[PDB]
Design an enzyme around this catalytic site. Structure first.
Site, PDB file in Angstrom:
ATOM      1  N   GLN A 190      -6.067   4.015 105.560  1.00  0.00           N
ATOM      2  CA  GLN A 190      -4.626   3.917 105.512  1.00  0.00           C
ATOM      3  C   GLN A 190      -4.025   4.587 106.753  1.00  0.00           C
ATOM      4  OE1 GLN A 190      -6.763   4.828 102.955  1.00  0.00           O
ATOM      5  NE2 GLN A 190      -6.046   3.968 100.976  1.00  0.00           N
ATOM      6  N   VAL A 247      -4.496   2.318 110.109  1.00  0.00           N
ATOM      7  CA  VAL A 247      -3.759   1.065 110.108  1.00  0.00           C
ATOM      8  C   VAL A 247      -2.248   1.290 110.117  1.00  0.00           C
ATOM      9  CG1 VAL A 247      -3.646  -1.148 108.897  1.00  0.00           C
ATOM     10  CG2 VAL A 247      -5.802   0.044 109.008  1.00  0.00           C
ATOM     11  N   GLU A 248      -1.768   2.401 109.530  1.00  0.00           N
ATOM     12  CA  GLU A 248      -0.337   2.786 109.534  1.00  0.00           C
ATOM     13  C   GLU A 248       0.145   3.251 110.907  1.00  0.00           C
ATOM     14  OE1 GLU A 248      -0.072   6.050 106.894  1.00  0.00           O
ATOM     15  OE2 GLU A 248      -0.519   4.827 105.115  1.00  0.00           O
ATOM     16  N   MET A 249      -0.768   3.817 111.711  1.00  0.00           N
ATOM     17  CA  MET A 249      -0.529   4.213 113.075  1.00  0.00           C
ATOM     18  C   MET A 249      -0.517   3.034 114.043  1.00  0.00           C
ATOM     19  SD  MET A 249      -2.472   6.997 115.300  1.00  0.00           S
ATOM     20  CE  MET A 249      -3.453   5.610 115.763  1.00  0.00           C
ATOM     21  N   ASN A 275      -0.166  -0.174 113.250  1.00  0.00           N
ATOM     22  CA  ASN A 275       0.461  -1.350 112.680  1.00  0.00           C
ATOM     23  C   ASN A 275       1.317  -0.870 111.526  1.00  0.00           C
ATOM     24  OD1 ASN A 275       0.976  -4.002 112.196  1.00  0.00           O
ATOM     25  ND2 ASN A 275      -1.157  -4.688 112.141  1.00  0.00           N
TER      26      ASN A 275
END
Ligand code: HEM
Ligand code: HEM
Ligand code: HEM
Ligand code: HEM
Ligand SMILES: [Ca+2]
Ligand SMILES: [Ca+2]
Lengths: 324, 313
Positions: free
Chosen positions: B111, B114-116, B118
């Protein structure tokens, strides 16, 4: 009717079931093994970040999913990375250039890349600093008092690339005898591919890969009024005036190596077809026609290689570090 | 010699012959196959340039050979990429921080990455635009009507990571019985590693990877341990499995030689003094911690479609 099976058979050949033989550069299990390690080893680049798999991705169609990129010294500027798959069959090694440059230019994709991203003395030092790579080069290049050289590193890699082939697409199973490997819209699209004369520039073992023509895709000037990546925006220009040319790319596995053309400007396979129904060639294409051709091009996707990921050996105290 | 062997059987455990079960996230062939595609799939990143393998490279000891990189949104600055190998057995998830801060820090390597690179909206949209991935998520996660979720993407990847483990190091074969699995210098290294007390912070199944301690390696024989207790600031004592193949060392990737990292660790701050020879013996011992690298088949990942978002420029 099956004039069609027999015509296709004349103009095309399937991918063989064996890596082809490379002149000056014989195949062996050890060499395929070494070549696999180096192809994935980012220590070939000065930064320790870029391998050949970064741009030429074996689980994504042999390409990188990007419009453009800069990997090889001879590049005219940023260019769409062609696929590594079936690359061994092509003879047009360069996207584009002056036709006189292109005839005498040296071949060697590995040496152009690594002399771009590093210097060979630093790569050879890397390879000599690791006892496993040294042992491998001895088994793979048996006669040599010193087998660890920049050009042997390129030979190993190329014996590996020549295993990266994609046999038994639906189309090759059709070439091989089986009419029903193609469905009816694939069969119709084959017919237009042939009658509309695509086959002239995109023909053979590789459906292209082999010729330069004075035609390039350009983004047409005036308007902001249509979706990004629409055909409306792009056209063929004629480049004969400037003795300039482009390769007509191999169309094998085209459905999985988007985006399209030397600049990576068209994302849709139907659209990349509509652009190629160009007057510059005397070709006219209806919507319906461009849709059946793209269907036929779907049949060009072969078996993708099963590549077990190389376990690359540890650097040692003698191994160059990432370049600051 | 018999005493040493029992002592080690006491303090450590071998890598198990098989992926451990993750509570609430069961292994299956399909979930493993899916989590593999997504770990190599650069379309998790908004630019379509970076995958997990980019920095946790499976053929290179599961790290990236760099001093520092920035892959997870909890990182306050660049840090050395820890190996993905045997990561499944660790509990100390972050490299360093204020002890209070870390206690409240949300976990999840997948998590936070991918949050960084996108947003979850854009990744889900990307996975939903490829029939082949929707089909796979429904087979792997049949208990849900819409299984294409940020949380399930992380689960699939994690069950794949749980397979990326490295049994049968010379050390592990010594723990299972074979004294000669270790050579003479390696054996002498182990005795020292035990006696000088390395094993206090680097013990159990993974030889570390489980505690935070108020000691960090900073610029000072150039680098040295520094006490950070006065700032309530802590660092993970990393698992030493495969340490020989995962240089450079420490949180900041400052030390490239494994013999020098052992010598930095032979620090007054812990009450350890190590001679030149002693550090060399122990380094030889850590050399026996490299296990069988997993044999991984490169995934064949499914083509985008006209609905798949383009690379973020
Ligand atoms: C040493 C590792 C590499 C190998 C073995 C390799 C292989 C190749 C091959 C074989 C071709 C010619 C294809 C054909 O003749 O049909 C080519 C062209 C190309 N590759 Fe690579 N490549 C490597 C590194 C890279 C990297 C790291 C990048 C991206 C940063 C890249 C991007 C490109 C591009 C843009 C072209 C087209 C160049 C042009 O003709 O304008 N390559 N590459
Ligand atoms: C309707 C028939 C044709 C179809 C469906 C077709 C298909 C394609 C496709 C799909 C591409 C992009 C491939 C890639 O990016 O990998 C392409 C590029 C190209 N083809 Fe065609 N083609 C046709 C006719 C022709 C003809 C008659 C010629 C030559 C006289 C030709 C020469 C070229 C050239 C030079 C490129 C590269 C242009 C650039 O990249 O800027 N094609 N074609
Ligand atoms: C979604 C794909 C990724 C996965 C599954 C993943 C996995 C992990 C795991 C499991 C950890 C902690 C290991 C442990 O706690 O024992 C970790 C930490 C780390 N990874 Fe990743 N990684 C991914 C993407 C990346 C990328 C793309 C980069 C680099 C650009 C990266 C660089 C790092 C760094 C620097 C750390 C240390 C973070 C810190 O605590 O300061 N990772 N990763
Ligand atoms: C002679 C005994 C010891 C040896 C051989 C040793 C070995 C190591 C090695 C090889 C590393 C680098 C691992 C990596 O980068 O992946 C490391 C880091 C570390 N170790 Fe030890 N260690 C010893 C004693 C200790 C003790 C007694 C503690 C805790 C009280 C400790 C805690 C840590 C911590 C917190 C780090 C990370 C610090 C940083 O990255 O800045 N170690 N140790
Ligand atoms: Ca392309
Ligand atoms: Ca490291």
């Amino acid at each position: 009717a099956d004039e069609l099976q027999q015509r296709a058979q004349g103009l095309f050949k399937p991918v063989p079931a064996k890596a082809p033989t490379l002149k000056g550069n014989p195949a062996s299990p050890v060499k395929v093994e070494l070549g696999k390690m180096l192809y994935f080893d980012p220590r070939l680049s000065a930064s320790h970040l870029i391998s050949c798999n970064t741009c030429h991705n074996v689980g994504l169609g042999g390409g990188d999913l990007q419009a453009t990129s800069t990997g090889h010294g001879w590049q005219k500027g940023p260019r769409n990375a062609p696929t590594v798959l079936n690359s061994v069959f092509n003879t047009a090694q360069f996207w584009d250039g002056r036709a006189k440059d292109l005839a005498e230019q040296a071949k060697g994709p590995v040496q152009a890349s690594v002399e771009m991203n590093n210097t060979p003395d630093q790569v050879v030092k890397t390879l000599n600093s690791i006892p496993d790579y040294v042992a491998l080069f001895k088994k793979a290049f048996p006669g040599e008092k010193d087998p660890v050289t920049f050009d042997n590193m390129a030979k190993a890699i190329e014996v590996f690339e020549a295993t990266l082939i994609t046999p038994d697409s639906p189309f090759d199973q059709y070439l091989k005898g089986k009419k029903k490997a193609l469905d009816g819209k694939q069969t119709a699209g084959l017919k237009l591919f042939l009658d509309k004369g695509c086959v002239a520039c995109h023909g053979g073992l590789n459906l292209g890969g082999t010729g330069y023509f004075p035609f390039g895709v350009v983004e047409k000037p005036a308007e902001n009024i249509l979706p990004l990546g629409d055909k409306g925006r792009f056209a063929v220009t004629n480049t004969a005036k400037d003795e300039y040319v482009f390769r007509a790319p191999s169309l094998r596995n085209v459905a999985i190596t988007y985006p399209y053309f030397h600049s990576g400007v068209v994302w849709s396979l139907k659209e990349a077809v509509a652009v190629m129904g160009s007057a510059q060639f005397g070709i006219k294409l209806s919507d319906d026609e461009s849709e059946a051709i793209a269907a036929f091009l779907g049949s060009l996707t072969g078996k993708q290689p099963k590549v077990v990921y190389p376990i690359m050996p540890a650097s040692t105290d003698a191994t160059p570090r990432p370049r600051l």
